[PDB]
Design a protein around this nucleic acid. Structure first.
Length: 366
RNA sequence: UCCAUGGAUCUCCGAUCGGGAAACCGUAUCCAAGCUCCGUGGCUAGUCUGCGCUCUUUGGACUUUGAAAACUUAGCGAACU
């Protein structure tokens, strides 16, 4: 589209000529597509040209444009200039220095970790905009992204020193950072911290909603501790929770990784029989086929492969351009072509690529 | 219990990676190709699409050292008597 014409403008004079034909002739710039222009600059890194076009148009309709522009400035990574452009946002009127603009830049910066600049700007302009409970919760998430758990706990003990109070999402973020640092500095230092953060939820009365169980399982699967995780998914009953896409996919994983093919199958079907799995993925099948193609488990691989065929979904070439590849890397004892008969000739509909499968693993097992 | 076969573990010096006051004290690389793991870039988010790491294990080539009684064949070569 016009966006894929802007992309081959690997050059700013190109955008000069094209914007001349757009605003003055094509009448497209006469729209928020100023957003797409300044974002072209925001990936060109030339936020100077970004502000050039901002100053050019300068019509007061740049809501989406200015919020995407700050999204640029934060990913292109200059928070100092980002706050500068907040003041410039006042002076440019495309936004309003209001609760909504502020509570949007908060989520613009809370996805990278620049909570220092963010907190300074919010705790200065909360002389005109105090009530920002969105920001109130989000700063904990931003500082969790920055992982500076001292600054996390300081935001906590300070929000306690105000009209604000701590919430479930805050404790989820805190536990995210806690278990991340635990499993990435000492695994056995993870064991006590989970309670040392859940009891916080408890004394705040916080409900341990299924997001928290997502947190537990997702920070227990990277640690090859999945028996505790499966048993937690069992005990999902006590608190007013239930499964989710996260939990079911991640408990199919890390149940494969630990030689539990049987329960793996069972729990795929339990995902579907809980009903959230009306779309597992076009990809997850290939994923935990990479799993059990890594561990030399092609037998149960073809097993779950007929299972996904009976699910019906069509595995793209993605599976086939590597399955016989694994079957023929499976040649320290060579079962290669006796199952080449089963999947290389097959793939009837994409038969040229299905035969193409041969020279690749042949070039690996020359 | 027990026999035979074949498998499991199998501490140390002698010693042979370095030190050593014998039985004790210190410690892999390079390169391919493997899922996991951990951030990185993509902004074009498209199997959302791709890079580069690690600990490890395989499987190689680098990475490397062996002893005895008499017998034999040699090199030396004596005095007592």
């Amino acid at each position: 589209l016009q966006t894929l014409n802007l992309s081959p403008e690997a050059g700013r004079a190109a955008l000069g000529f094209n914007e001349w034909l757009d605003s003055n002739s094509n009448f497209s710039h006469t729209d928020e597509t100023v957003s797409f222009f300044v974002d072209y600059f925001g990936r060109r890194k030339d936020f100077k040209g970004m502000l050039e076009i901002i100053s050019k148009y300068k019509g007061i309709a740049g809501g989406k444009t200015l919020e995407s522009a700050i999204d640029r400035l934060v990913r292109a990574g200059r928070p100092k200039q980002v706050t500068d452009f907040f003041e410039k946002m006042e002076n440019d009127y495309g936004l309003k220095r209001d609760k909504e603009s502020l509570t949007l830049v908060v989520k613009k910066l809370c996805e990278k970790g620049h909570a220092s600049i963010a907190e300074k700007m919010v705790k200065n302009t909360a002389n005109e905009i105090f009530p920002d409970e969105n920001i109130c919760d989000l700063l904990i998430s931003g500082w969790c992204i920055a992982e500076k758990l001292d600054e996390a706990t300081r935001l906590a003990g300070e929000m306690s020193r105000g009209g604000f109070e701590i919430g479930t999402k805050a404790y989820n973020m805190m536990l995210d950072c806690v278990c991340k640092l635990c499993r990435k500095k000492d695994p056995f230092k993870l064991q006590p911290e989970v309670e040392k953060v859940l009891l916080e939820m408890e004394f705040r009365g916080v409900p341990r909603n299924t997001e928290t169980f997502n947190v537990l399982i997702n920070n227990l699967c990277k640690i090859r501790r999945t028996e505790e995780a499966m048993t937690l998914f069992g005990r999902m009953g006590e608190w007013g929770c239930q499964p989710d896409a996260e939990t079911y996919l991640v408990l199919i994983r890390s149940l494969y990784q630990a030689a539990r093919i049987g329960e793996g199958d069972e729990m795929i079907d339990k995902m579907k029989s809980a009903g959230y799995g009306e779309l597992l993925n076009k990809k997850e099948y290939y994923g935990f086929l990479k799993i059990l193609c890594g561990i030399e488990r092609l037998e149960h691989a073809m097993s779950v492969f007929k299972s996904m065929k009976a699910n019906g979904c069509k595995p793209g070439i993605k599976t086939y351009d590597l399955l016989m590849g694994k079957m023929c890397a499976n040649n320290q004892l060579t079962r290669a072509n006796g199952l080449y008969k089963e999947a290389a000739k097959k793939g009837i509909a994409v038969s040229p690529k299905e035969y193409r499968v041969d020279p690749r693993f042949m070039k690996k097992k020359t």
